[model samples]
Target chain A: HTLHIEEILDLLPHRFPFLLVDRVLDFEEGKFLRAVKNVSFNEPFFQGHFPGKPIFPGVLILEAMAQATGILAFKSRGKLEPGELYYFAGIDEARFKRPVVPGDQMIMEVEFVKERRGLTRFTGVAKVDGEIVCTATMMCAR
Target chain B: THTLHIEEILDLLPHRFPFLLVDRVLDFEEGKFLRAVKNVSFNEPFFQGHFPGKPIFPGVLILEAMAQATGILAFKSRGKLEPGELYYFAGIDEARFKRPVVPGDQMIMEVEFVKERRGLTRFTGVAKVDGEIVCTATMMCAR
Candidate 1:
């Protein structure tokens, strides 16, 4: 079964305001993270990312994408042992191809590339209705 | 003059006078653009030879300065390098030295990103002095 909100809550430490994902559709063990966020008119940052107009910040989408990336590692790593911590180590060539707005469902997919020394690299692309919205080179490490 | 005069430029390139080529970086933007300068002087050590009567900054040196300009841009975005990290140019393209840099001319170097894929980044560079072009090239990096 695809994971529900409660499972996502168990997998991620984030809550309210800062927590971007509402659900994850699927993920391949230790390989990729796929998740979704239903953008809302009431979303907090829309107030300051602009006024009278609300476009989701490209960075926050990237942030959400990475959070999904993190859960994949942690959950799969959990199969080996339970508790662990990870950090956002770096991001590269994070190109924002389009904007996300309220009423749109943003889908994020992050793929595991490799691990060397202490850094783990991932590639991400966020989309709406299968149209590409963003792409990034994301990294996480202990 | 939004730049490093000596110690900072000195800090990055790990090269010295008669070799550093660039004395200052005029501007920089993350993952995109950089401007640098070399205040070529008549008293420059190389002007002493290559024929004393002909004091020209070597055209090839302008090429090195263009390569270093891209180097500085990448290094700035990468933050400070951790131990065991090193930088190198993978290749360069279409380098044309349109004019010889001369003593007393300020070499104004402008470099901008072209594209990137699979960790190899491409940038185009232009070297100019007082509205005239001196040299131009495209470069690649393994950053």
Candidate 2:
């Protein structure tokens, strides 16, 4: 199934600036998710990250991947409650392979690794135009 | 005398307010370690979007603060941060968040050297509040 912006907002507890994922292209409930983020020059980080050269910050790339993982984790648990929170518990083996700049569309692919009790692990990969930009093993808890 | 103020931080790194996570450098030892501070305030921009009601500081930004601490240490160790060069995070490993960071709390960040090969540098980082561990991670950066 695919999710639109409103549906994504409903499943996630994030908003603008910090909310990295824009749309869910596909999802398999408890198994996998594919999300997208269209980078723009209007982003706040570009202003000071460097005066003239605006490359998307690498840490934020990881954050975007983690946000996708958060959505997958929440969906795997059925539906979210009013106060329920899915938080980043840990991240392992994260690496950036290239720089993401303005006007690039980032595709984030996340898959469930293992879930036990309240903790869930996911393998996340982010790509731009089929080129790997970042990847990581992320953990989350509710 | 060992502390670096905002002006010096601005000179070393290209980040400005809202994006600049490090507030002050408490101490530093070139090629060894460094301690920095980032005072989390309710007015921070991310808190507005992270949660309008709950206001929990995002874990990723906590890691970002740690990375900035490492940036300062690396730049100082090399004697200068060139105008055309940028420090980029190449990897992160074994990152964990033990507690939620909130407004009114001061985040104390510490980073120590792991190793450096060619232009890739590795460092182990830990963040605290009031002497309590809040986060830890292994970060790598390329110059």
Candidate 3:
């Protein structure tokens, strides 16, 4: 699937600091998708998160992965589904094995596991240098 | 205005030890933007386990600080927290990390309102160090 920042901006209501997915790599309707985020050292968290030895927080990895799922939701909706809301239903079985750090390029992969009416379920994985850093199963509601 | 001192910020927010990432509120414009700061130190709890010799600040907390600052903005903008009024981070996208934040480093957070709809206010926020962007995100909040 085709997705640029501009297209992403159009699909999601997020902007600037809260918009996590810089550029989505690929998406297939509501079935599967992948995205990448370039982590830098200039992050605000680096300021006090550890100061000298900064570690990428695990929760954000989950959020980034979830945002990728939201992108798929947006694309799957196509046009004119306005005035609706997509709420985070829940997350389960979240696991983190490695530390995410600056200068690490995070690759997120998501798969649609189940969907009914406005409820969608997804499984996600986040990796660095092809190594698994985190995984989760998340649900969202419209 | 000067960055909010720890004592002053304590008076302004409800967050306490461990949860408080912001030590100061720098400036703000209603319905527009907010700025704040966090002072890092070696005495933090995470330092013990993060690394014995090398302590690094966890990145997610920085975003939390930014989020907290946004909460202050929202509260101050509305002049009060209404019944059942809660701002939750609905989503975050386009996050990038820069440099390792070590002790003595200062985290500066800035947030700008993109727009608000149906109780969700979208914001463009950035964390900077010495004028260098450390990270940025587009965040959504709902009450």
Candidate 4:
């Protein structure tokens, strides 16, 4: 089932500028999901980040991919408990291949790697127009 | 001078306010270790909805701060950041957060070079408040 902003809100505690995933494009329970984020110049960070030349920070790209992983992790459980916290415990083998700029729609793909007890791992890739921009393996714990 | 102010930081990093996590450089040894500070305030935009009643600084931001420290160390060691060039985080490993950071807490970050060769550098980063370790990570970056 695909998810909208409303369902995403229920899945994640993040909001506003911090909530990087804009829409869920596809989902397969306990396996994988694809999400979209529309980048805009209106983002607050642009005001000061470069001033004359703005480039989306790579760390935020990782954040967006991690958000997608969080969605997949929670939905894999079928039901989300109120106040349940999922922590970003680790990031490994992250690589930024290209710069992300304004007006580029970021497509995030996340696949479950493993899950044990309250901890989970996922590998994520972020792309723009079919070009890979960033990839990372992340860990989360509840 | 070992201490770097915001102006110098702006020259070394492309990040601006709100996104620029490192507030001041307390000590820097070029290629060795760099220690900095991040003052968490109540007015941070993310705090508005991080929680309606209880506010806690996001762990991602803490990681960001540590990464910034790595950036500073890289630039300092090189003596300057070339125009149009930016240091980017290439990898992060074994990151762990020990406690939730709240407004009014001053996060002290210390990053040291673990290995460096051919544009890739690995670092060990740790953050603390009042002498207690709050977060730690091993990060890698490239120019």
Candidate 5:
């Protein structure tokens, strides 16, 4: 059975508002993942971000990607474990192609590169429409 | 001294090519308030990937504009904020949006201080275009 938000909540400890990912299309336990963040103009950070040109910041995009990656990591283990902190260890060759704006739907796809001990490796891509907005190779230590 | 336009902004911020957003500082008052603009273009790099034909600017970049505009204010307050010191996003609160900002639109921003003491400044900022509010938020910075 495919997991939705409700099932995703059971896998992770994050609650509403802070949990940016709204829907999960498919999630493979410990291998690969796909999720969606419905970027809207109504988000709190969008205000005062830019008045006439409302653009999402790179950091937040990175965060959203990281959160998606975090979910993948948790699911890979088959369940959520307590006392684990997912730290964004580093990002390599991250690129931003298109500006992500409100009302745009982000399709996030992530894959597991490898897992050594407690550290996991992943490569993530976030896109709007068919274009790749951000992509990076990241490593996180839990 | 000449007024800082988008070109001048390009010379100040660390971003280049498709990343820079602030078009110009039309008006600014040192240590009190600041105004800046961003010129949207369809040819932007991110636009190519954000959406095929219906490109929309990213919301985070909008916040960067606010942060960049606040950088100008921080620059003006050099006595407290030192030169070459970059402001980090300590925190953001109560941000809201009113409308969509598209290409060819000019985003104007205004920032005012909520508290400024000991090189740590907190501000409440607003972004607008053609008299319409697009974004607003409270930001804190420590230099």
Candidate 6:
């Protein structure tokens, strides 16, 4: 719980643009992580997604949850070795319920489902202002 | 019914710079299909990490690129959206990312109309680079 950007850097290889996670509000180690991503009007993707009415991309919201899973995996285990990357492999049954826009502090909740050779599974749900916006089953592999 | 240049694309889509993933529409058949291209470049904002010096294009963006193609088709089929209505990515299923697409690769994305029931539309999406499949899925959207 209470992981900051600097500590998150130690756990995640992602930086600018690609890194969607802003802060970790709480975590249960091998259980779950509640993370926050502060969506801003200045976000790069919003510039092209729609100039007149920019709505944050839903796929990026999936990536945000994927990153949260990455953090959960790293924290539950240990720091990733240099040059080793934890990758967003795939997803299933991803359902988007609401639209997320600028100024919405998206809170992502990702929890461990299981783990096996080379693959770890998770279930994620994202909300903005306490409203559910998206949920999915995500996969990550190293 | 035609190939759309960037200007034509701009006329239909509200997407702008870096986030506008589709570069051109090679062909469109009204409500049936759309083929678009995204020329992956190293300078893309999402490539900065490690950028891994790996330079692998994020697969999530590939889906967005596919969805945009559908968006283009929907807008073309129905003309400009009614006021206050916007395209929504309803869901995706069986998304499989098979390979790592890198910088300098040109993604050829095809979205085939699967079905549109009620107010929702679905498409089977495939993204290929160099004649090989990198990802495939069924994506649904609504306005």
The reply for model 4, stretches above 4 Å from the true place, is: none
Q: Give the DockQ-based CAPRI class for model 3.
A: incorrect
Name the candidate, 4 or 6, with the larger DockQ value.
6
Model 6 misplacement above 4 A: A116-118, B50-52, B82-84
TM-score, prediction 2: 0.96
Q: Give the range of the ten consecutive residues with the poorest summed lDDT in model 2 chain A.
A: A75-84
Score residue B117 of candidate 4 by CA lDDT.
67
Candidate 5 lDDT, B1-143, residue by residue in tens: 33587666654554444445677887777778888878878766556533344555655567667877887777765543434444555545555545667788888899886687555578878988788988776766665
Native interface contact recovery, all models: 0.00, 0.73, 0.02, 0.56, 0.02, 0.84
The complex in candidate 1 yields a DockQ of 0.01
| Model 6, global lDDT | 0.87
lDDT string, candidate 6, A57-100, tens digits: 89989999999998988888887888787877788999999889
User: Where does the lowest 10-residue lDDT sum fall in candidate 1 chain B?
Assistant: B45-54
lDDT of 1 at A128: 94
lDDT of 6 at A106: 98
Per-residue alpha-carbon lDDT of candidate 2 for residues B2-119, written as tens digits (9 for 90 to 100): 7998999998887875679999999998999999999999888888788868899888888889999898998899856678778888988999999999999999999999898777
- Residue A30 lDDT, candidate 1, scale 0-100: 82
In Å, residue A95's CA in model 1 sits off its true spot by: 0.8
DockQ of each: 0.01, 0.77, 0.04, 0.56, 0.05, 0.73
lDDT of 3 by residue, B6-96 (tens): 7766555555555567777888888888898878898876665344455656555566777778877776676654443445555555544
For the predicted complex of model 4, DockQ is 0.56
- TM-score of each prediction: 0.50, 0.96, 0.51, 0.91, 0.52, 0.94
How high is each candidate's interface RMSD, in Å?
23.5, 1.2, 14.9, 2.0, 14.6, 1.6
Q: Rank candidates by lDDT, best first.
A: 2, 6, 4, 1, 3, 5
